Design a protein around this ligand. Sequence first.
Ligand SMILES: *[C@@H]1O[C@H](CO)[C@@H](O[C@@H]2O[C@H](CO)[C@@H](O[C@@H]3O[C@H](CO)[C@@H](O)[C@H](O)[C@@H]3O)[C@H](O)[C@H]2NC(C)=O)[C@H](O)[C@H]1NC(C)=O
Ligand SMILES: *[C@@H]1O[C@H](CO)[C@@H](O[C@@H]2O[C@H](CO)[C@@H](O[C@@H]3O[C@H](CO)[C@@H](O)[C@H](O)[C@@H]3O)[C@H](O)[C@H]2NC(C)=O)[C@H](O)[C@H]1NC(C)=O
Ligand SMILES: *[C@H]1O[C@H](CO)[C@@H](O[C@@H]2O[C@H](CO)[C@@H](O[C@@H]3O[C@H](CO)[C@@H](O)[C@H](O)[C@@H]3O)[C@H](O)[C@H]2NC(C)=O)[C@H](O)[C@H]1NC(C)=O
Ligand SMILES: *[C@@H]1O[C@H](CO)[C@@H](O)[C@H](O)[C@H]1NC(C)=O
Lengths: 480, 492
Amino acid sequence: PALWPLPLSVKMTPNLLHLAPENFYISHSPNSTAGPSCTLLEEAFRRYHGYIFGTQVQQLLVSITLQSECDAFPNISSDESYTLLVKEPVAVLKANRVWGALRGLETFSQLVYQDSYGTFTINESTIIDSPRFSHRGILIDTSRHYLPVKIILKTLDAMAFNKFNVLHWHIVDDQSFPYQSITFPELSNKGSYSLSHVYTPNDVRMVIEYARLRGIRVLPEFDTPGHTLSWGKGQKDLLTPCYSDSFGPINPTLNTTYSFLTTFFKEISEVFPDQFIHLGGDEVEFKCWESNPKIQDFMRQKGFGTDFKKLESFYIQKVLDIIATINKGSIVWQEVFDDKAKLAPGTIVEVWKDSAYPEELSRVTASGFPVILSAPWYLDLISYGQDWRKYYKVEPLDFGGTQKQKQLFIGGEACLWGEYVDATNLTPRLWPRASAVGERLWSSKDVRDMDDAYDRLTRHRCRMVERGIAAQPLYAGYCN
Amino acid sequence: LWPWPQNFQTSDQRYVLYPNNFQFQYDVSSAAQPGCSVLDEAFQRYRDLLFGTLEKNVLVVSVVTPGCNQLPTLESVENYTLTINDDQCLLLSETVWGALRGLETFSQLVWKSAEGTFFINKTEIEDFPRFPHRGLLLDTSRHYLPLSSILDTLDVMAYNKLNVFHWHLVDDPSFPYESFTFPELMRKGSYNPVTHIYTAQDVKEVIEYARLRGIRVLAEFDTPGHTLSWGPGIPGLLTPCYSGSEPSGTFGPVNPSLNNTYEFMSTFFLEVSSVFPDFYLHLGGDEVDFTCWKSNPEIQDFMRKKGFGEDFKQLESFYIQTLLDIVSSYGKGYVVWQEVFDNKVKIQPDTIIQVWREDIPVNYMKELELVTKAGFRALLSAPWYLNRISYGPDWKDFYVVEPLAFEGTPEQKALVIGGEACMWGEYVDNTNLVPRLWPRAGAVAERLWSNKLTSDLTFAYERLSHFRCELLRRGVQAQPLNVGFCEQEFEQ
Ligand SMILES: *[C@@H]1O[C@H](CO)[C@@H](O[C@@H]2O[C@H](CO)[C@@H](O[C@@H]3O[C@H](CO)[C@@H](O)[C@H](O)[C@@H]3O)[C@H](O)[C@H]2NC(C)=O)[C@H](O)[C@H]1NC(C)=O
Ligand SMILES: *[C@@H]1O[C@H](CO)[C@@H](O[C@@H]2O[C@H](CO)[C@@H](O[C@@H]3O[C@H](CO)[C@@H](O)[C@H](O)[C@@H]3O)[C@H](O)[C@H]2NC(C)=O)[C@H](O)[C@H]1NC(C)=O
Ligand SMILES: *[C@H]1O[C@H](CO)[C@@H](O[C@@H]2O[C@H](CO)[C@@H](O[C@@H]3O[C@H](CO)[C@@H](O)[C@H](O)[C@@H]3O)[C@H](O)[C@H]2NC(C)=O)[C@H](O)[C@H]1NC(C)=O
Ligand SMILES: *[C@@H]1O[C@H](CO)[C@@H](O)[C@H](O)[C@H]1NC(C)=O
């Protein structure tokens, strides 16, 4: 079977079952906590009836065990587990929440195929499946290159087929500021490449609701205090002036900065319904801060000496409180943790450096903080050949630590930075290389057979192509 | 402007253009006149691209007559001059193919201000290609390419002034070419005998489509290596490999010890020479493995009769020699990979060698020296393997390459007729062809057309990135060079 990712448990039997387009129905079970009043499932049923088709199983009953959470937004603690039963004359899909039903519908569509004569068929089977990790996401960079909403929505569809549940939206950065702020409209009006290259409130609202209907969380990132050269276009005196004429990172000495961030992140807390907010805090250069007389004074009145890691820690902690004040979680790059900053209980850390990253995982988990991995999965760094194997071979839980420290590891992300990536090459460059990460983050640890991986990935890649996703080939061959 | 012209004298004196009331007209003096298929379609195609004191007209005059129905050749002259001022607006080209180049150059010089007003600066140009053979290779075997993808590529080759389409039709995994002399080749070699096929109608459309763009169609049916898809359909053609005593399933290169083989090639290449009008044909001869031949006892016997011995380099020569004679008898020239030259194969003085290897057996610059000193003509492709992707802007690597940077005399260096960029399809198909091709292939385009002195990376970036946004405007899915943006971002 061309299943991807490979489910936890699969029990296939050589017994064939045929389906009929204008006779097959997907409806709720009489004793389910979700009914026809559930918009999410209703949409998912009609949507997958198109993917499946476009000794007879007549109906697929979707039974939600616990409280569906039909109208809610997915969070880190969501239950995506499900159990599938393919039999005549009624197939049964049972799951605790609604999130499992989505994943189950995907798996179910991957089991239906057409035989030699075009007859829709499916080997009857029994599947029990649940994600190994709860945080499986994809990072997109809409600052280094503006991405039309269409391709972001297509990325979401592709993420649904590959069972990803988090969209790390790296919306702004040095090059441009495409995010249209309601409170501060000058950020995008002066900081974006152009006025057409801007994400309006409705564009963002559309991305989030499109993702929810598929069980994808929209994780926003507004990197600070580094990667903010575009922030200082619509906001005066926000960035540190470089003397000795360019500008540096955000100035952490002025009270205007924190008053601005408070009202800025308060907007973000209401725009993005996800609990966590990525703050960035990476690749921060101290060159400019060290050459500013006004700032050097702030070093004395606080007694930080000449160690700007404390000035870095002073700023990030100030921002962390703002996020904590508005009842939101926080995610941050590894620099901040390494800078000896104090993180609140529950703060997520994202490891991204190659140099001894398993050791970083050890340190973060040792300190009792949850961790996310992205170091070995920098997909923007392309190379000749089947590099999907390099990403597939990666084993996350390979680092020193107790069994209690392994629970702090919640997952990872495949990043596609856009220094050389836009709408022209995003889809092909992302898939199906990210699919390798998808299976590694969902399927069991002992699922590592190359021949089988290659076999299923080629056929799954062709499936993405038929579903409108321009995924590039792994090697020489063909689809259809 | 891309590529950069040999002699381009610019100015800041501008003229106003009119989208609708702008027309291309011939000069009564010209050799090409209304009825010239190439230019008639060109004027139509270009007015759609541009508009899909002041200037209303653009005079086009060709001095050399040679119709517009005959296809371009290696000897075709592409000289042209673009004269735009207060008195005149004239495009003077030596031949019809030079006019095509002139129109493309003209299209890129047309610009619009922030007001949206169309303009054209006071320009005086005297341009010509540095090399006559500026090609680009497509591998339609490893992955099939729909006719539309090939025609689109030809449209962009025209924008970059590339005049040779190196069609690598068949190879080991697939044989999509439909042969009428041997229908079993396509029926049992292609991925799918219907959907992934190239008909006689498809081939003649490519040729004519390329002809209108002034592009030659170099066909390559690689032999004797890269022929696994030939096996089924024509039995006995391939060499059955041996383990020691008995055959062990796997097949190798074409069997050069059978009479059946040479009568097949004679009949097959007769069709090839008939279908493809170009004077030259690529015969391959690359990555030929002698392992399978040596293991075969029946072939071991063959070399003892002809008296070759233990070297398969001259056994290969026997195959190619015969093959060259067959193709030569049809009045066809031929291009071949560097292995043929490296393996001391008895070779005709008019044969062209295409350098592709980087280090083994010798540096590619040292190869050009050997090939040219030996007396043969040479194509350069070694450092222009687009299929070999890497992170960042590797287009700078392709752009900086100097084809004539080797030891030799003036007339010895004159044997270098250009080169080709190569997009092998191991990891490329309809899904990622365009973005991976352009504008990286444009770096090679300029190095083969422009002067030796045009090499500034900064000046290259400015024009290439400006050309990249223009490609997008024309509907081309070209990837970005670096951080930035085009006002009309790609969205289709
Ligand atoms: C064709 O002629 C036009 C005008 O007749 C030329 O357009 C000019 O382009 C230059 C170069 O970008 C522009 O100058 C720019 O001005 C800004 C400040 O306004 C300066 O900071 C930039 O560094 C740059 O120099 C200019 O606005 C524009 N028009 C004028 C009035 O000169 C164009 O260059 C000509 N085309 C070519 C390349 O032959
Ligand atoms: C197309 O353009 C090319 C190059 O612009 C022309 O070829 C070149 O023509 C020039 C002038 O006719 C030749 O220059 C001459 O060189 C001889 C020495 O061989 C010298 O004695 C003369 O005083 C003169 O400088 C040049 O050799 C020749 N070759 C190249 C490539 O530069 C070609 O004529 C043009 N085609 C047509 C038919 O107009
Ligand atoms: C549902 O899926 C099962 C499992 O993949 C399929 O069963 C497969 O049935 C084929 C057709 O007979 C078997 O192929 C056979 O292989 C033997 C050599 O072992 C060969 O001699 C025969 O000519 C034939 O091709 C295959 O072994 C078997 N399982 C696999 C791994 O594919 C089947 O497609 C579905 N259920 C049924 C029985 O319709
Ligand atoms: C192959 O054998 C045929 C049959 O006599 C003959 O006509 C042809 O000349 C032979 N080809 C050679 C000499 O390889």
